[PDB]
Amino acid sequence: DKYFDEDHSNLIVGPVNKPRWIYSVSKQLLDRVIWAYGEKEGLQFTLFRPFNWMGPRLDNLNAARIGSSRAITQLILNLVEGSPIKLIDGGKQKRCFTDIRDGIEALYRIIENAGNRCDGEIINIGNPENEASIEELGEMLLASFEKHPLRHHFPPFAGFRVVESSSYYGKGYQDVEHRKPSIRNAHRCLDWEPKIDMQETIDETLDFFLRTVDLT
Amino acid sequence: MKTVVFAYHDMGCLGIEALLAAGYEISAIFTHTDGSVARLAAERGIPVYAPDNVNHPLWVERIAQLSPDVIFSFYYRHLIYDEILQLAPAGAFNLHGSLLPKYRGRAPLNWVLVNGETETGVTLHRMVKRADAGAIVAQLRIAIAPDDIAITLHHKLCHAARQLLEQTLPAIKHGNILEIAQRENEATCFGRRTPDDSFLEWHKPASVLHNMVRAVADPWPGAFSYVGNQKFTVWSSRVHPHASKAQPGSVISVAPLLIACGDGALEIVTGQAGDGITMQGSQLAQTLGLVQGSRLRRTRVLILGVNGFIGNHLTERLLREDHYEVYGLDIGSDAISRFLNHPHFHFVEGDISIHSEWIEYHVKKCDVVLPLVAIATPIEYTRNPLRVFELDFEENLRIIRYCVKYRKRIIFPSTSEVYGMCSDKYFDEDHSNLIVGPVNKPRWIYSVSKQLLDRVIWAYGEKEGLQFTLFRPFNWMGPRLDNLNAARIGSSRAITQLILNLVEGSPIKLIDGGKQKRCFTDIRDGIEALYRIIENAGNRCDGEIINIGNPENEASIEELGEMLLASFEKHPLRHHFPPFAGFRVVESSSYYGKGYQDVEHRKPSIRNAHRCLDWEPKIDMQETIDETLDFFLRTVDLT
Amino acid sequence: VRAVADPWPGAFSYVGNQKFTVWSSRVHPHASKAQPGSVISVAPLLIACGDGALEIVTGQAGDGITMQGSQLAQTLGLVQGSRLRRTRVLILGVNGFIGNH
Amino acid sequence: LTERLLREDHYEVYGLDIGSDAISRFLNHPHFHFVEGDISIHSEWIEYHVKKCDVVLPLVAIATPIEYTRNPLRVFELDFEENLRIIRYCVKYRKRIIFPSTSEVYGMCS
Ligand SMILES: O=C(O)[C@H]1O[C@H](OP(=O)(O)OP(=O)(O)OC[C@H]2O[C@@H](n3ccc(=O)[nH]c3=O)[C@H](O)[C@@H]2O)[C@H](O)[C@@H](O)[C@@H]1O
Ligand SMILES: O=C(O)[C@H]1O[C@H](OP(=O)(O)OP(=O)(O)OC[C@H]2O[C@@H](n3ccc(=O)[nH]c3=O)[C@H](O)[C@@H]2O)[C@H](O)[C@@H](O)[C@@H]1O
Ligand SMILES: Nc1ncnc2c1ncn2[C@@H]1O[C@H](COP(=O)(O)OP(=O)(O)OP(=O)(O)O)[C@@H](O)[C@H]1O
Ligand SMILES: Nc1ncnc2c1ncn2[C@@H]1O[C@H](COP(=O)(O)OP(=O)(O)OP(=O)(O)O)[C@@H](O)[C@H]1O
């Protein structure tokens, strides 16, 4: 679907021989169990689905050294250590990046649960307006990095390089070509609307992490 | 000219060199990881690559970029195929180590020694769809000395190749070559030799055996035999026409170590006991304990939920064979009571959530575990999602873990429902994507639960060596598929539910029109395939996921209903039951409740089954309908 | 690199997290105000040392195949840029004779 | 020992073991009560019988030297831990225990 809908979209994962979906399927089974408990035992719940939230503290440069971090924070490690930014399978796949500030605001509203409008609700939280390919993310990041005050402390850019997903994630990786959320439920239950634009999130994030590097 | 080379090992280096000295421009070299072809390429400043599959689009695209005139293959191990081969206008030639069309298979250097040929050679032929079949561009004979061994002949061939290329390579560079086609009715082919192919069978002639030790002498693995439980390797042999009334395999003497063969005797000049160091025969004789004397229970299957539809039928099948011992536990026992007197059947009435001592002890004791305990009647997915989750998922995950703990083989029953509303014409175990609906459509809790289990078993296999085989049944049906009683609560699969309708005189409802279809498989077909999986011939089922269904028996629920009705009307017992109340379309919600969603079509790919089991469904649907109907009608008490 | 050249394990270094091995070297008295460890050029692959530069003639990134330096430079992502908490002790019975001391 | 005890009339023999080929000949004996079990799994039976019987002879072990070096931990767990559990059932239910020590306990005594 053009818009992943909490109440109508179908869920699609790959073959069992594509273990990257173990996470997806695990989280889905939990959503279903919570749902059953809600229906069959009165559990009061609210499920929220973040859409590529990013900003300061999204992982750390150190974990990124092992690939154990999300894209944005990983690419920052690249610029920092002077290694090239690899675009898994061309990096043409896109995502909708959401500023952590927007995300936390929506979540806050959910905790507030004004009018109990969130009970039994499944709510996506993302900014459908910040859709961008990983390649574009890499460029925007690079642009900011070049203008940054601390730039001169790090090595010269080693450039962008297309890489086979297998050589980064190992055998059994498969990915999502596009991901955009429907934010109707969020609007209906929280009267919420994402506001911060992607570029601003990129700047915030980059700054935080660059000032994380000990220079000496 | 300009070329792209695919080389490896020795032939690879002489090939690249010959090519260089001949004035060719090498755009790139493709080789493998581990004289090193890479080092050479590196030393010459020729871009070298080692992908696992050069046939991949990216590479094909990149190789095309280089725009090569001709392609050469000098002992490249992976297989280069058409797609890329035809990118070279001048063609693609390969250098094979035999006098084609003879020994066109692989491992010719060894095979020719095995069969004791008197000569061999190198052939540079064109690459065509068929392996080593292409028109010959040049060939060159080599005499195999009586005292030649794999390694010494290897150099012989290398030297020959260096000479053949040296002169026929400049020829190709222009256009002076004749594609002398191959005499197809003379070609011989051989396959990969495994170290088990170098086993010595003393009943054969000393000549034969002697060629064996030569064929695979050091640096190759070598010819081996056994002294009781002990395995030793013969590195140096020596045929003795010196007869010996001694029976083949017996030791004629220990100095020299002379073994009696079917024809003449073989002298073991040097060899090694086990992974020991090499030593002279006389010493090897001692370290093996030789003197003048000759050289060289049933499977326990654990079935949990043995009284079930799959369970009882599988038990019947296994009990037929003699090499099986069946251990089973279940809440009920009416389906397996007929086996209680069988010596190889050990049943016990238990609950997977209570009787731990027995269950664990038996996973620990048996050889294969088949956890068939579950709830697989759709109505229950929406009606009792949590009971399904706990039994189908949690209870089984516990058994899966007993299996990894005691390193046992587990043949876990997956489901065709794991594919969900997949859109492929054929649901493929290794390629189809899995599609389910929203969380507000609880019918998928079963599908998703079984899928997570498949994935966990898969991780245990990959990360912890668990030996497994997942099998997915596609609407299997036949006698005992549920029971008329459970059907009174909707707790049964379609076929058995519709029979209850005919029996009680209530209408057959077609959920949402009943236009959705399924591929119905006869339980006899299913059990046969499963049996094969237990047999696991050649271990061809390890780590495999196998669908089991008859793609030929596709039918809509409406058609199933008609076929059933037709049989029912012709059944001898018909007059005992009320008049047909007719078919009636019904909203799924009024039968399954809120949150139901279904599969519009389900057909399996049965390739894997064919490949791993050499299995193929046989029984046609109508026959299954009859069987099933008859069983259940004769279940009804008439009085 | 000579001392442990093939068939020996070989001399190695790191490009960030990546480890690579130098099989063929070549000293260049050719100065370079470049600080030691930084890449002077990628063709030939010339690394600035404490005294003079070292040219990596052939090497391999990780466990990959050997290749000429220029190519090794690319496969490592090199351009003109530089190459290459406290311990927690748990004491149970810490108040004891050995422990407190 | 079972053969020996089964000869006398004043004995009732209860036994558990992984195997049963050596004692199958006694399965028909009225005074012999055998059950195929594992000391590390079948607790209900083991505890109930230490509680029910008069003397306990914990003969489960691994006593083939190669195993001491080859599988030291398996030896430790079975020979020591599993048995320490039986010893304790005995003190819990105040039962007589005829424990099988070993000449190997003397080691290289002089
Ligand atoms: O916050 C989100 O919505 C989701 O973020 C991640 O999943 P994903 O976005 O697929 O993966 P990232 O690691 O964030 O990177 C996105 C894509 O960029 C690409 N990428 C990443 C890293 C890199 O160095 N290069 C590169 O091209 C990969 O194809 C990767 O899948 C998490 O795995 C999800 O649990 C989470 O819900
Ligand atoms: O053996 C199979 O492969 C699968 O069978 C069942 O799932 P399913 O085939 O969807 O459901 P059935 O109860 O067998 O009936 C098939 C369809 O017939 C229709 N039906 C059923 C009953 C009835 O009275 N009327 C009717 O129209 C329903 O739409 C139903 O989904 C099980 O739920 C799966 O776990 C199993 O893998
Ligand atoms: N808690 C339990 N303990 C032991 N056995 C159980 C338990 N719950 C269910 N079972 C058993 O599981 C058995 C197998 O289930 P059933 O025959 O209904 O389906 P199935 O043969 O797996 O069907 P399909 O092959 O269509 O999935 C039942 O006969 C039942 O006795
Ligand atoms: N159950 C327990 N839980 C926690 N600490 C304990 C317990 N039993 C004893 N201890 C501690 O262990 C500490 C260490 O023992 P202690 O100082 O007597 O000897 P030690 O320093 O080990 O002597 P040596 O070095 O001569 O063997 C004691 O100070 C005591 O507090």
Side-chain angles (χ1 to χ4, degrees), chain B residues 16 52 109 115 182 215 226 345 376 410 494 496 524 561 568 583:
Chain B
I16 292 180
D52 273 77
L109 171 66
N115 310 325
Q182 289 194 188
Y226 290 93
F345 185 56
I410 187 179
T496 182
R524 305 198 226 65
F568 181 55
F583 296 105

Side-chain angles (χ1 to χ4, degrees), chain B residues 305 307-310 329-332 350-352 372-374 376 391 493:
Chain B
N307 198 240
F309 175 55
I310 295 181
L329 166 157
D330 190 309
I331 292 307
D351 188 316
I352 40 168
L372 307 192
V373 177
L391 203 251
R493 263 135 313 191

Side-chain angles (χ1 to χ4, degrees), chain B residues 203-216:
Chain B
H203 66 70
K204 299 178 183 179
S207 305
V208 183
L209 298 173
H210 182 293
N211 295 327
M212 191 63 242
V213 328
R214 290 200 302 157
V216 292

Side-chain angles (χ1 to χ4, degrees), chain B residues 378 381 415-416 443 446 473 475 493 509 511 516 518 596:
Chain B
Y381 307 165
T415 170
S416 59
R443 125 141 216 184
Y446 174 73
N475 293 90
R493 263 135 313 191
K509 33 171 60 55
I511 280 80
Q516 60 277 203
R518 297 274 189 285
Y596 177 80

